[PDB]
Design a protein around this ligand. Structure first.
Ligand code: CDL
Ligand code: 3PE
Lengths: 171, 70
């Protein structure tokens, strides 16, 4: 067949969000609140193109907007966030429910210094709409032309010409 | 009298207390002073292997926070 095209290693260099999973899980509700638009443009491009090579730049925007999400935490509320993700980080299942007062301190300092409202129960699971400028893929599966169907039956049904025509049976 | 059965019950209770306290102290020792990560589900395993990558020292439990980003 053909050669599969791959992007170069410079096309894959972006500054990584090099924080732990409890750090990501601690700020995840405010992350889904504040980093909505580039994340949803990326996941729309990712379910529509069905190809990650066509989804690099939007992904870079994700990694552009996540870092600016954490810098904006690090400039303002580094200590209550640190006290919060440490308590998230203790738990083996990483329970939100074991960590409600540290969550309250982090949410208080974030609403005071950044004005961010934490999403409620049922908001980040909504199907939202995304206004992009990229065109709709007319053939995301790269499917070739389908075979033409067999001709259907038409014409009025006539009797059998002289019956069964089986050796001597005249009907 | 009836308190003569209590030394054997206390010895058997220490023998039942040893495995739980043992596995609690060992899980705190081997995991950076914290609980062992429970990975029943593949998302938990993905986050745990991503922690092992982002720690830089090949350990999932070495946590990196805001100080790791600029
Ligand atoms: C206005 C609206 C109202 C109008 C009303 C008008 C009518 C009023 C009268 C009402 C009664 C109508 C009767 C039926 C129509 C005429 C049937 C007919 O003569 O067919 C000729 C038919 C072929 O002749 P034709 O010149 O081509 O057609 C003239 C007509 O246009 C025949 O028409 P066709 O050209 O369209 O023929 C079609 C085609 C013509 O046939 C073919 O193209 C060839 C294929 C035939 C089958 C061959 C099978 C061979 C191997 C098996 C042999 C079995 C053993 C032999 C019998 C042992 C005893 C059971 O038929 C078949 O293929 C069907 C199979 C044959 C059925 C015949 C009727 C049987 C009814 C009585 C059953 C009693 C036993 C009869 C004999 C059984 C064996 C056939 O003759 C035969 O096949 C030979 C058998 C004799 C005919 C049966 C006569 C019926 C009356 C019998 C009275 C006596 C009974 C005595 C006691 C019982 C016996 C022990
Ligand atoms: C998780 C908890 C598990 C706990 C398990 C154990 C429960 C029981 C603990 C021990 C209880 C006390 C046992 C005392 C036994 C009798 C001691 C004694 O005095 O024996 C005397 C005998 C002969 O003495 P002799 O010198 O000949 O006397 C002449 C004196 N003019 O001298 C002898 O027979 C020699 C000395 C024998 C001493 C044996 C002591 C018991 C050994 C049991 C094995 C397990 C020990 C504990 C293990 C876990 C902790 C490290």
């Amino acid at each position: 067949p053909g050669i599969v095209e791959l992007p170069s290693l410079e096309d894959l260099k972006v500054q990584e969000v090099k924080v732990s999973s409890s750090v990501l899980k601690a700020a995840a509700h405010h992350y889904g609140a504040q980093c909505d638009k580039p994340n949803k443009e990326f996941m729309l491009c990712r379910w529509e193109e069905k190809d990650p090579r066509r989804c690099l730049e939007e992904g870079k925007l994700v990694n552009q907007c996540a870092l600016e999400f954490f810098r904006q935490i690090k400039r303002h509320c580094a200590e209550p966030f640190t006290e919060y993700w440490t308590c998230i980080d203790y738990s083996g299942l990483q329970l939100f429910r074991r960590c409600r007062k540290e969550q309250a301190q982090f949410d208080k300092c974030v609403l005071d210094k950044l004005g961010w409202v934490r999403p409620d129960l049922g908001e980040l699971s909504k199907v939202t709409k995304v206004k992009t400028d990229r065109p709709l893929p007319e053939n995301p599966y790269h499917s070739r032309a389908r075979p033409e169907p067999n001709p259907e039956v038409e014409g009025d049904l006539k009797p059998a010409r002289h019956g069964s025509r089986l050796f001597f049976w005249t009907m | 009298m009836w308190f003569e059965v209590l030394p054997g019950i206390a010895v058997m209770g220490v023998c039942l207390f040893i495995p739980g306290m043992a596995t609690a102290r060992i899980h705190r020792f081997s995991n950076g002073g914290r609980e062992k990560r429970v990975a029943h589900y593949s998302y938990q395993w993905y986050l745990m292997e991503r922690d092992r990558r982002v720690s830089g020292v090949n350990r999932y439990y070495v946590s990196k926070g805001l100080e790791n980003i600029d």
